[PDB]
Each structure stands twice: as C-alpha cells, then as structure tokens.
Design a protein around this ligand. Structure first.
Ligand SMILES: CC(C)(COP(=O)(O)OP(=O)(O)OC[C@H]1O[C@@H](n2cnc3c(N)ncnc32)[C@H](O)[C@@H]1OP(=O)(O)O)[C@@H](O)C(=O)NCCC(=O)NCCS
Ligand SMILES: CC(C)(COP(=O)(O)OP(=O)(O)OC[C@H]1O[C@@H](n2cnc3c(N)ncnc32)[C@H](O)[C@@H]1OP(=O)(O)O)[C@@H](O)C(=O)NCCC(=O)NCCS
Ligand SMILES: O=C1C[C@@H](c2ccc(O)c(O)c2)Oc2cc(O)cc(O)c21
Ligand SMILES: O=C1C[C@@H](c2ccc(O)c(O)c2)Oc2cc(O)cc(O)c21
Lengths: 389, 389
C-alpha cells in the first residue's frame, strides 16, 4: 500500500559526457564568427568581440554548428531573422542525440543493464517539444516503457544544481531507484550574428559551447557491485537580492535570446559567502565538529564566466588552486550551461584517481557544487566525496 | 550533515482553483469561433465543428481570450500566421497571474503563513521563459527567496499526474516540507483559426479551456492544525504500446500546434486495464486484503475528451456513476490540460463534504488519479481518501 524508501544518501554511481566532434579554437573564433556572419566590415564591434575572446579563459569549444551547416542555413548567420522553427528542428533532434552519447557512457561505466534505470531527468535550455527530450532519449536508449520521466526545459545555467536537487529525493525516497540524469545543451538555439544592438549576445558568443553529461544517481549502492563517487547531502536554492532581470532569456521567433547585466559577477560574489556559510552551518550544526574551511572543501562551480570565478575567489579568499578543476573545464569546453558542473565533477574525480589522491574530491571530504542562472538563482549542493583505494 | 526526512504519506492539505472570468457557452461557440476568425463562408468545415461541439460534453468554458482581445490582435484570429512572440507576451504574464489566484486560495484554506511554503512546482503547457513561470509566481506571492522551485514546461495533459509524482518525493523526503503545486493553462498559446488543413486543431477548439489549480502537499500534517484531504501512496508512469505520435505538440513560430490521432481513445481504453491491475497488485500484494473492485474506488480521470471517458468506462465495466465527478468538470470547464485532474479532486472532496459522505473520496477509501498525454504517456496515482467527521 506503499512504496518503500531507500536508506543511504543519494550517490553518483557513474558519469558520462559527450561533445560534438567539431572543435573551434578560441584564437580562430573572432575571424570565424565574423566571417560566416558577413560582419567583417563591423570593425569596432569585432575588436570589442576580440577583447571578450582574449579575456574569456576559454581555449576551445565543441560546437554542433559547422561552417557548412551555417552556409546551408543563412537565417542562422543573419541577425534577428525569424529562425526558431529551423532551430527547433535541429535541437529537438540533436539535444537528445548528444544526451544519448553521454547516457550510454554512464551506463557502460555503471555496468548494470539499462532496464534497471527506474527514473529519468532530462534538463536542457535548447529547444522544447511534446513529447519532450526525455521521451526522445528514452526511445533512443530503449529504456523500459514505465521509466518515470521528468523534462526540465528552459532552466539555464543553474540546471546542474536543480537536477541534483530533484534526483536526491527521487533516489532517497524510492528503494531500488536508479535515476538517469542528463543535461544536454546545443548552442544552435541561440547562435546569431553580431550587432552593436545587443552587446549581451556577444558575451554569449565568446563563452557558450555544446555538451551533454549523464549521471546514474541512486541510494544504497550494492557493495562490490556498484561504486559511489559522490554523495548528495544538502541542497539549497536562493534568489539573490537586487538581481531582478540580471539574467533573462526569451524564446522568440528569432530563437532564444539572452540578456545579461554587467553586474552579475558583483551580485554573485557579494552574496555567495552568506549562502555558503548558512549551508555549512546547517550541515555542521553546533549543539560537534565545526565546518571545514573553504580551502579544505572541494569546489564544483558553474563557470558562468571568468569574472564570476575571479570575483568569487577574491571575495571568499579562496586559495588559487581551489577552482582549478572548474577552470580546466571552462578552458577546454567553455560554458555549457546546465551540463557544465557535471563535466567538472567528472574532471575532478578523474584527476583524483589519476593523481592517487585520497578521495574523489581531490583529497577533501566535503565539497560544494554551485549553479547560477536566471533569477538570479543560485543552486547549492553540499557533497561528500568517497575515499579512494 | 543531513536533511531529515518525513514519516507519513504525502498529503493534499488544501486545494485552490481559478479561471478567467469570461465564460463562453458551448451552444454559442461555433458561431463565435467562426465569426471572430472570419471563416463563416467555410460552410462544411463549420458543420463539422458544430458536430464536435454537439458531442463534446462541454457546456461552458472559461477563456482568457475575449472577442475584444481577438479583435485587437488579428494575427491570433488568422490561420498559420506568425504569432508566437505575441502569444508568449500574453501567457508569460497571464499564466503566473491565473496561477497566483489559485495559489492564494489554497494558502488561505491551508491557513499557515505563506513563508512556510518550502518548495514550489509550477506546471504549464502555455508558454516558456527565463526566469520561468515558477519564478514569476514566487514573485507575485512574495514567497521566501529560498523556496526550492521547479518549472515543468511543455508537459501537456498528463502533467497533473506528474506534479503529484514529484511532489510526493519532495514532501516525504524533507521533514517539514510544504510543497505548493500549481498547474496553470491558458489557451491563448494554441488558439488559431479553423481550416480543413488540420482537423486535429479543430478538436482542440471544441474541448480546451483555461484554468489553474493549486495544492499544498506535505507529509505529517500537524494534528488539529492542518487537514489532509487525500494521501499519495503509489505512482506509476507508462508509455502505451503502439502509440508513437499519438499526441504531438510543437512550439512553432505560429504558436503551439496540436496533433492528435483518432485512435487515442482506443489506445488508452485498451491498455488502461493492465496498468491499473498491475498498480493495484503492487499496492495490495498477496503474500492479505485483495484490491478493491473498480466500482469501490474513487476516480479522478483526466477527461481528454468524452470518447476517452466513454471507452475507458466501457472497457473496464465501470458503473455509470464512477466518472460523474470527472464528467462534471469537463461539462463546466472543458479540458484544462494539466490542471483538470486537480479541479476534479476539488469537486469530489467538496461534493463529499456537502453530501455528508463518509470520506473525501465520495465514501470510498482508495482511489485512482489518471493523466494522459504526449507519449502516449499515462500517469497513474493511487490515492487514499480521508474519513469525514
Ligand atoms: C569575459 C568578460 C565576459 C570577461 O572580460 P573582462 O574581464 O570583463 O574584461 P573587459 O571588461 O575588458 O571586457 C571587454 C568588453 O566586454 C564587455 N562586457 C562585459 N560584460 C558585458 C555584458 N554583460 N554586456 C555587454 N558587454 C559586456 C565590456 O563592456 C568590454 O567592452 P569594451 O572593451 O569595449 O569596454 C567578463 O565580464 C565575464 O566573465 N563576465 C561574466 C559573463 C557572465 O555573466 N556569464 C554568466 C552567464 S549567462
Ligand atoms: C468529441 C470527439 C472529440 C467526440 O465526438 P465523437 O463521439 O467522436 O463523434 P463523431 O465521430 O461524430 O465526431 C465528429 C467529427 O469529429 C471528427 N474527429 C474526431 N476525432 C478527431 C481527430 N482526432 N482528428 C480529426 N477529426 C476528428 C470526426 O472525424 C468527425 O467528423 P465527421 O463528422 O465529419 O465525420 C471525440 O472523438 C473525442 O472525444 N475524442 C477525444 C479527443 C482527444 O483525443 N482528446 C484527448 C487529448 S489531446
Ligand atoms: O540564452 C541562453 C543560452 C543557453 C545555451 C543553450 C545551449 C548551449 O549549448 C549553451 O552553452 C547555452 O544557456 C543559457 C543559460 C542561462 O542561464 C541563460 C540563458 O539566456 C542561456
Ligand atoms: O497543444 C496543446 C494545448 C495545451 C493547452 C494549453 C493551454 C490551455 O489552456 C489548454 O486547455 C491546453 O494542452 C495540450 C496538452 C497536450 O497533451 C497536448 C497538446 O498539444 C496540448
């Protein structure tokens, strides 16, 4: 008359990632972007975009859109031309497909048959449809027809925190539940030509890349059969003060548009300390061990842009190595919206194993995953690593 | 280092509903719809639409769109004209607003200050935005800035089951959690002129109406302070066999479009028995009382259309009164997509109280809530009523 619940903390049992094969190196992107968009005559706009690329701390990105595809579809290279139907036709197909590559890698690592997946969460900011990308992914994988699905559309850059916040309750409240979590982002929904009109969209052109990540999340891993890599222990969500309209995105007839105030780094950096201090106080209450210091935590931080990272690091006084895993993903992949923190989680555990650190969190026991996006919404997850060998 | 979980079953503690004030009676709708759309010359198409309205078992609907608004915005009255940006500007505002009316009613009934709401789920098929309708509703209500939000976009007619499936885990896995659940639907996103092109969209014009419903869901109601009306005990989700493309909806430059095969009733009716029999077997396992008979359950059934209800009733052999609560909502409000089953839940408990039946479920202990939509997805929730006086 009842659904048995699980006992232990929701745990990450496997991670997979996937990116489009086409690589664009940042040194080449100003020429490329202004070339295929027919805007090289816009001489001062391009110098402005060159400075954004020079400062982006992005070396390369993987992009579904190629010069050939852009040549085939000139309404994408144009500026403010109607093109949503064209964008949707692309991403309603390619977002689940990219997600399927990451999902198959995570399942292969996990090692159990795909029919043990009981739940699915699909998160994307690229396109919407009915049935949704969750249904399409289930069809592509051949998941059981009774998988409990959830599609999280139009989330944006905090979505990596959101999927963990939901997956935690699904795994913990359902005995045996194994949650496939996929975030998949493809910039074909936003890509548009340059214009002194909208210097916000330029920022997006310098930073956003494509990618998908997949997790298996479940409570009570079977001993010597499944392997936990991180545990979810505490979650919080906050709308930061005086941030109305900081980050807005609209799905228009010209596609997805992006609006971004210059004070996003300030708003984030100046509020994040109180959020983290409160979260750590709840996880480590006095009544008892004190919370670890920031430098004794591992850090999985959504790299909205280098200015956000630099100002957060400065305001919290983080030692300069704490954001190294985060900054490596931004350098090699750019900002992949909701998927990015799961790429960072993967990079951190793999570094930790390769370098024989004592835990999956670079040697630290406790850790923080942060997502930031429209709201301005800050998603906080307190994680525990797992000891290695 | 941990979030305490709750103990008892997730319970519905209050329900509110809201509809646009403009009423259109079905007897008037063929003339009205073909009038404001400039299509009265389409003589045989209209006779076809008259027969759909005659058969709809819908007496009236509440619609945000008025003749005055349609006169002001002729691209809505047209057929296949670009109009998404216009539709979004409407529903990104009006869907949260309608939802706020229902939410305030549910909170007023519940009786606790609005700051005790810890979580929010907003479900809609009408428009998408960043930040989302969940953020807008929180702003309209003045909810705490740390409310844990979730926006479920592009769900469709199964969404009433989905929100209960998620809210169950949120309430049960978080001690003290009180989940505001809102479904809000406004047909301005789909409304378009008639055409022998697309006889699917005609079906939608005869059945779909507007409305919003709101729940407070929480585990462990405080005795003599909060009041439970229904308990969530079991949830299931199924993709019905040989239903690929049964019900599709796309968000296009002309707005939201709707595609619907004629065999939806057949697919639903011919598969539903096995789903319910399995669900009841899980809730009442042999090893022990047998499951109640269908006629001894209460029924909260999404009324996709009268043909779905009639064929489900026939195939399962339901006594003719079991779907009376469901059919009363369809008659007085039409199909309000994801909100409809919560209107039906409200109607049933209010009937039960008014008629002094022994339980909130028309006198029956156990009950079934069913949502159907794109997939073809069937959402099943097994509910327990609460005894009255
Ligand atoms: C890469 C930028 C992107 C980093 O460069 P920087 O350290 O700011 O260096 P600069 O200030 O020289 O930036 C160069 C140009 O970017 C422009 N710029 C920066 N942020 C901008 C914004 N939000 N909108 C428009 N222009 C912006 C500056 O105005 C400047 O123009 P100018 O050289 O003609 O004066 C940085 O501001 C950043 O990281 N911002 C975070 C972006 C963000 O908010 N992302 C989160 C997500 S949606
Ligand atoms: C109201 C209809 C809507 C009920 O009427 P009915 O009992 O079918 O009566 P009829 O078959 O005389 O219907 C009249 C017309 O509707 C048309 N019709 C019914 N379903 C249709 C569909 N999916 N697409 C196009 N036309 C349809 C019939 O072709 C018929 O046309 P005709 O009179 O010119 O031959 C009914 O088929 C129904 O309830 N369907 C369920 C709709 C549905 O699937 N909703 C769930 C959600 S998205
Ligand atoms: O406007 C967007 C773009 C979006 C996005 C889509 C696809 C990608 O591959 C990608 O890297 C990004 O991500 C966003 C995230 C936000 O928080 C706000 C936005 O406007 C957007
Ligand atoms: O195409 C739609 C329309 C949608 C809807 C929106 C707003 C309303 O007020 C309303 O009653 C309905 O509901 C749908 C539900 C589905 O399952 C499929 C759809 O295509 C649609």
């Amino acid at each position: 008359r009842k659904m048995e619940r699980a006992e232990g903390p929701a745990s990450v049992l496997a991670i997979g990632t996937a990116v489009p094969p086409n690589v664009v190196y940042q040194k080449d992107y100003p020429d490329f972007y202004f070339g295929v968009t027919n805007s090289n005559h816009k001489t001062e706009l391009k110098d402005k975009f060159q400075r954004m690329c020079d400062k982006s701390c992005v070396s390369k990105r993987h992009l579904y859109l190629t010069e050939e595809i852009l040549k085939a579809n000139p309404s994408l290279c144009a500026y403010w031309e109607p093109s949503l139907d064209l964008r949707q036709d692309i991403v309603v197909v390619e977002v689940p497909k990219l997600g399927k590559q990451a999902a198959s890698a995570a399942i292969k690592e996990w090692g159990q048959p795909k029919s043990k997946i009981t739940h699915l969460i699909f998160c994307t900011t690229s396109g919407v449809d009915m049935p949704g990308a969750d249904w399409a992914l289930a069809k592509l994988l051949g998941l059981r027809s009774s998988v409990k699905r959830l599609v999280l559309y139009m989330q944006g850059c905090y979505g990596g925190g959101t999927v963990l916040r939901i997956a935690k309750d699904l795994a913990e409240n359902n005995k045996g539940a194994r949650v496939l979590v996929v975030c998949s982002e493809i910039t074909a929904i936003t890509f548009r030509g340059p214009s002194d009109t909208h210097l916000d969209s330029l920022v997006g052109q310098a930073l956003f890349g494509d990618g998908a990540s997949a997790l298996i999340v479940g409570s009570d891993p079977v001993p010597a059969v499944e392997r936990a890599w991180f545990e979810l222990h505490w979650t919080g969500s906050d709308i930061l003060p005086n941030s109305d309209g900081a980050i807005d995105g609209h799905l228009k007839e010209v596609g997805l548009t992006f609006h971004l105030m210059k004070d996003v780094p300030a708003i984030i950096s100046k509020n994040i300390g109180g959020i983290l201090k409160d979260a750590l106080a709840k996880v480590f209450p006095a009544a008892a061990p004190p919370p670890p210091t920031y430098n004794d935590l591992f850090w999985i931080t959504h790299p909205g842009g280098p200015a956000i990272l630099d100002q957060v690091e400065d305001r919290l006084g983080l030692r300069k190595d704490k954001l190294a895993s985060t900054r490596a993903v931004l350098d090699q992949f750019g900002n992949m919206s909701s998927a990015t923190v799961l790429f960072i989680m993967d990079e951190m555990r793999k570094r930790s194993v390769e370098q024989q650190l004592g835990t999956t969190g670079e040697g630290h026991e406790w850790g923080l995953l942060l997502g930031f996006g429209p709201g301005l919404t800050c998603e906080t997850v307190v994680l525990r690593s797992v000891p290695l060998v």
